[PDB]
Amino acid sequence: RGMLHQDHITFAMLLARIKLKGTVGEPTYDAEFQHFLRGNEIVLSAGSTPRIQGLTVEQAEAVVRLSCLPAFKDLIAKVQADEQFGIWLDSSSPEQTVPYLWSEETPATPIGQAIHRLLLIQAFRPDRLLAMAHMFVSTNLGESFMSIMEQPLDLTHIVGTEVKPNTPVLMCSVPGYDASGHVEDLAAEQNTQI
Amino acid sequence: LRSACDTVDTWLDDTAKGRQNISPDKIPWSALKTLMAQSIYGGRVDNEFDQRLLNTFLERLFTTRSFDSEFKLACKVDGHKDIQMPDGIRREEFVQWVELLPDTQTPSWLGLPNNAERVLLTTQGVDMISKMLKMQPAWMRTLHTTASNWLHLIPQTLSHLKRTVENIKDPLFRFFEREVKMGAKLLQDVRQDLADVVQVCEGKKKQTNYLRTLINELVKGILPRSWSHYTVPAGMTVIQWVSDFSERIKQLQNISLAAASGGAKELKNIHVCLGGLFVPEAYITATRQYVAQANSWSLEELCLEVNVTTSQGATLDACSFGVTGLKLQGATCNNNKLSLSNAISTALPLTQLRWVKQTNTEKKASVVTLPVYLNFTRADLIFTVDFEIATKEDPRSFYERGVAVLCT
Amino acid sequence: HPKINEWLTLVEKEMRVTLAKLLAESVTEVEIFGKATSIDPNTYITWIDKYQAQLVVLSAQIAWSENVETALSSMGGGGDAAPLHSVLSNVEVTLNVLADSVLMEQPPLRRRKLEHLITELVHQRDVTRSLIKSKIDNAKSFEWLSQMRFYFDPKQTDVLQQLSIQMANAKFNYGFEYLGVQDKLVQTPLTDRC
Amino acid sequence: QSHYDFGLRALKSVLVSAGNVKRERIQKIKREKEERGEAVDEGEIAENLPEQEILIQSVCETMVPKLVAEDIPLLFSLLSDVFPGVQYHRGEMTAL
Numbered sequence: 001r002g003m004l005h006q007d008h009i010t011f012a013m014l015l016a017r018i019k020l021k022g023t024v025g026e027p028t029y030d031a032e033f034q035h036f037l038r039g040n041e042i043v044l045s046a047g048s049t050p051r052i053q054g055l056t057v058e059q060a061e062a063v064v065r066l067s068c069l070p071a072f073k074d075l076i077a078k079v080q081a082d083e084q085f086g087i088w089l090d091s092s093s094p095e096q097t098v099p100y101l102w103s104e105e106t107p108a109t110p111i112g113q114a115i116h117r118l119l120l121i122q123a124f125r126p127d128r129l130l131a132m133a134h135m136f137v138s139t140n141l142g143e144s145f146m147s148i149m150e151q152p153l154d155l156t157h158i159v160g161t162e163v164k165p166n167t168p169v170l171m172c173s174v175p176g177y178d179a180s181g182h183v184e185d186l187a188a189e190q191n192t193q194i
Numbered sequence: 195l196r197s198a199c200d201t202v203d204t205w206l207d208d209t210a211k212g213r214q215n216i217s218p219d220k221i222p223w224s225a226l227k228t229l230m231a232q233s234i235y236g237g238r239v240d241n242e243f244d245q246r247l248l249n250t251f252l253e254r255l256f257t258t259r260s261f262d263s264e265f266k267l268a269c270k271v272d273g274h275k276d277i278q279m280p281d282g283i284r285r286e287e288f289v290q291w292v293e294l295l296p297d298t299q300t301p302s303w304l305g306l307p308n309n310a311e312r313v314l315l316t317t318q319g320v321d322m323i324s325k326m327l328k329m330q331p332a333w334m335r336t337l338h339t340t341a342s343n344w345l346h347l348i349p350q351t352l353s354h355l356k357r358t359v360e361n362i363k364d365p366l367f368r369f370f371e372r373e374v375k376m377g378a379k380l381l382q383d384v385r386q387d388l389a390d391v392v393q394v395c396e397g398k399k400k401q402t403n404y405l406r407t408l409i410n411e412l413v414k415g416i417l418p419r420s421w422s423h424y425t426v427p428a429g430m431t432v433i434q435w436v437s438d439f440s441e442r443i444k445q446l447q448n449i450s451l452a453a454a455s456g457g458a459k460e461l462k463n464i465h466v467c468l469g470g471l472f473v474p475e476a477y478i479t480a481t482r483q484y485v486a487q488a489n490s491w492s493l494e495e496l497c498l499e500v501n502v503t504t505s506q507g508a509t510l511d512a513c514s515f516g517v518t519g520l521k522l523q524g525a526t527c528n529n530n531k532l533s534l535s536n537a538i539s540t541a542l543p544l545t546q547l548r549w550v551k552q553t554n555t556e557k558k559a560s561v562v563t564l565p566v567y568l569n570f571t572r573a574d575l576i577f578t579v580d581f582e583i584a585t586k587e588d589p590r591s592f593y594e595r596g597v598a599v600l601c602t
Numbered sequence: 603h604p605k606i607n608e609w610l611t612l613v614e615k616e617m618r619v620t621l622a623k624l625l626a627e628s629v630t631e632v633e634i635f636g637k638a639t640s641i642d643p644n645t646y647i648t649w650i651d652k653y654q655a656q657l658v659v660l661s662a663q664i665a666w667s668e669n670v671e672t673a674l675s676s677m678g679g680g681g682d683a684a685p686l687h688s689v690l691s692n693v694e695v696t697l698n699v700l701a702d703s704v705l706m707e708q709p710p711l712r713r714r715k716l717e718h719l720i721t722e723l724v725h726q727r728d729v730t731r732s733l734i735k736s737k738i739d740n741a742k743s744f745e746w747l748s749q750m751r752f753y754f755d756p757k758q759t760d761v762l763q764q765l766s767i768q769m770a771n772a773k774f775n776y777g778f779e780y781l782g783v784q785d786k787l788v789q790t791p792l793t794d795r796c
Numbered sequence: 797q798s799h800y801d802f803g804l805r806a807l808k809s810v811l812v813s814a815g816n817v818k819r820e821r822i823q824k825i826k827r828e829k830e831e832r833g834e835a836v837d838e839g840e841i842a843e844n845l846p847e848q849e850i851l852i853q854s855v856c857e858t859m860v861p862k863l864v865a866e867d868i869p870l871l872f873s874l875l876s877d878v879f880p881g882v883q884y885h886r887g888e889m890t891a892l
């Protein structure tokens with residue numbers, strides 16, 4: 001409630017990771033998350049990157065970086081074998097239909113599958129990363145976890161119960177927005193002189 | 195929003211004196227549209243094309259046709275679907291319809307192309323990655339090398355134009371005079387400063403206050419304020435400025451060399467890039483003045499029509515000039531006809547600007563006027579061009595998608 | 603009233619009331635020049651010299667507004683003819699007389715009055731042309747409502763409340779402050795929007 | 797130049813100066829015609845009135861003093877282009 005709307009996904013994803021570390025039945029996923037955070041820093045020579053048909057130089061670079069993971073060792077072979085891959089790559093919302101391009105010796109849980117599709121989305125369609133991240137949170141914390149953040153803010157209950165008289169209500173607005181009217185309306189509704 | 199609601203309330207009470215129901219035609223659509231386009235929402239608008247877009251939206255939404263069952267609030271939201279006007283007659287059903295909107299929203303809801311938020315979403319994702327990660331002398335030699343490379347890349351000579359009794363009467367000469375003079379002054383100043391920096395980095399001349407400030411700005415990659423004379427995008431580094439300035443000096447060198455030998459004839463027939471010119475709108479008005487003087491007409495009765503050639507180097511008429519480097523945003527030009535495109539930009543190879551006498555005839559209801567901005571910031575309006583849409587397009591859709599021409 | 607403030611207040615109030623009465627007389631005199639086909643230059647110049655510059659321009663505005671209002675009311679049926687041309691014609695002939703008056707030597711005060719009248723009648727002529735071109739046939743249409751309109755009510759017991767200025771939503775009363783001879787502005791479309 | 801301005805203020809100043817110059821030219825012509833013979837007519841004077849010369853005189857009285865040396869030929873060339881034929885004879889303030 002006191003954060004810019006662009007930072008909601010960051011805090012939600014960190015909460016999802018915290019809950020994931022607290023799950024007895026889930027792996028730690030250290031390598032996949034470490035790559036998701038710091039894989040663009042993997043140094044690779046110009047000649048090491050090949051030219052995969054249908055993928056630009058940036059997508060090819062992302063693919064060859066992501067191939068270092070054991071589950072994506074043969075990613076190039078999988079993407080070249082699948083000819084309808086371009087249809088997904090040019091889809092409006094590819095994150096809803098991420099294709100299975102990682103090798104598993106056991107059927108992974110939906111959470112680990114979410115990390116895998118998330119890495120694939122980052123490698124292939126970075127513009128669709130945020131949406132993918134959102135779905136990741138929904139797999140860890142529920143689909144409604146962000147739902148309250150989409151509704152108009154309810155000042156009544158918060159200032160009536162959650163706010164102590166000692167704690168001031170700081171109302172920080174970006175330029176072009178003013179919360180004075182909200183407070184005046186709130187005081188008018190409660191019949192309280194302000 | 196409060197002002198618009200107050201206007202709606204006042205005009206509805208004025209038109210409906212307490213009557214339970216009124217015909218949709220009796221609703222003062224013109225009053226609401228004009229007040230919202232001139233006073234409420236049009237007051238902040240200081241651009242004619244923004245006002246045009248606001249007028250387009252207001253004339254789309256605030257008509258009697260909004261009260262029918264078939265009205266589309268938005269079209270081509272995903273290329274197949276469209277947003278339907280709720281058929282409710284009470285606040286509760288409208289709020290219910292709003293609460294039932296799909297969670298997926300694209301800029302096509304706003305009339306913009308779907309590829310408008312690609313860069314924004316990519317940057318937001320990279321920023322989210324950086325934020326998640328975040329909470330988990332040699333400078334003398336480098337500056338010497340950088341300044342030496344800059345001096346090698348930057349041209350050396352730019353001679354002023356030669357004023358003559360009959361040369362002053364030519365507006366093209368009158369404008370290229372300012373261009374070449376300013377270019378030569380900037381070239382000399384920049385070369386002198388760079389040579390001083392090189393000599394300082396060799397420990398041959400003592401560093402002074404001006405040299406200290408210039409070096410401090412150079413090592414951190416900020417464009418010096420003494421060099422910034424023409425309009426540039428705000429967030430541009432010094433490498434990009436050096437490259438652009440070198441290109442501008444080369445173009446001005448070509449202009450001066452052409453003007454020196456031959457006179458004002460090849461001066462009319464020289465290819466120019468508006469992005470490289472320091473004041474392109476002055477070039478536009480100079481060509482307008484040249485055509486007016488050649489034909490002994492007035493400027494206000496001369497209108498401009500643009501012809502995008504399929505190739506560069508085609509011959510030009512006596513009232514048509516050739517300009518290069520123009521980029522069309524959100525549309526493609528084929529056979530002098532515009533089609534709505536899903537690409538970011540399309541490079542116009544060479545366009546002929548031709549000045550002709552006004553016929554006082556209204557446009558053919560299929561002609562779009564497009565602004566020609568100096569750069570991607572769309573902060574400076576150089577002039578306007580006129581094209582004809584494709585066989586199955588809509589000028590309103592052209593306005594809603596922000597189609598415009600960029601000089602660079 | 604030997605107190606300075608008392609008789610100064612009396613002077614201000616009497617200035618307002620005298621201006622209101624003089625405006626009433628000016629309107630009842632200029633309604634002859636309006637609603638007519640031919641204007642004698644001599645009597646028009648006599649009327650201009652008799653009354654104050656602000657009152658002269660105000661009376662011209664009142665006469666034109668009433669003429670246009672009655673012409674629009676006469677076309678309430680939609681299919682009726684167009685008397686607006688006559689109103690336009692009236693403006694035209696008036697402007698011509700004014701255009702003839704400034705072409706020769708005039709006293710400075712009367713010259714400034716003539717310039718003010720020329721500016722106001724040019725604006726009225728433009729507005730009438732716009733109304734005719736748009737085929738306005740209702741007095742409640744916004745194309746006429748959007749314009750600044752003056753209404754004089756001679757049967758009002760209060761002289762200060764006799765004149766009302768309305769511009770499409772707003773009801774103003776003339777303040778009757780003595781403005782002397784101000785430098786009138788050209789009523790550009792930007793001025794109308796302002 | 798930093799001291800150049802060609803906005804609405806300069807235009808309106810030029811227009812007011814043009815009106816004043818027209819009035820003083822009318823007065824001067826009237827006085828000359830009264831002193832030389834006896835024949836004056838408002839219509840004849842208005843018809844034989846060089847209004848373009850009046851505007852040129854006002855423009856050169858207001859805009860020329862601010863110009864730098866090289867812009868004076870440019871401004872006079874623009875005057876010739878937009879106002880062909882007309883020329884500006886600067887007044888001679890002998891007593892001054």
Ligand SMILES: Nc1ncnc2c1ncn2[C@@H]1O[C@H](COP(=O)(O)OP(=O)(O)O)[C@@H](O)[C@H]1O
Nearest residue numbers: 785786787788789790792793804805806808809
């Ligand atoms: N509609 C108009 N008609 C006549 N003169 C005008 C008009 N608008 C502006 N001007 C003139 O332009 C000049 C500058 O206007 P000004 O009030 O200084 O604007 P700002 O407050 O933006 O500086 C004024 O001297 C004024 O006489």
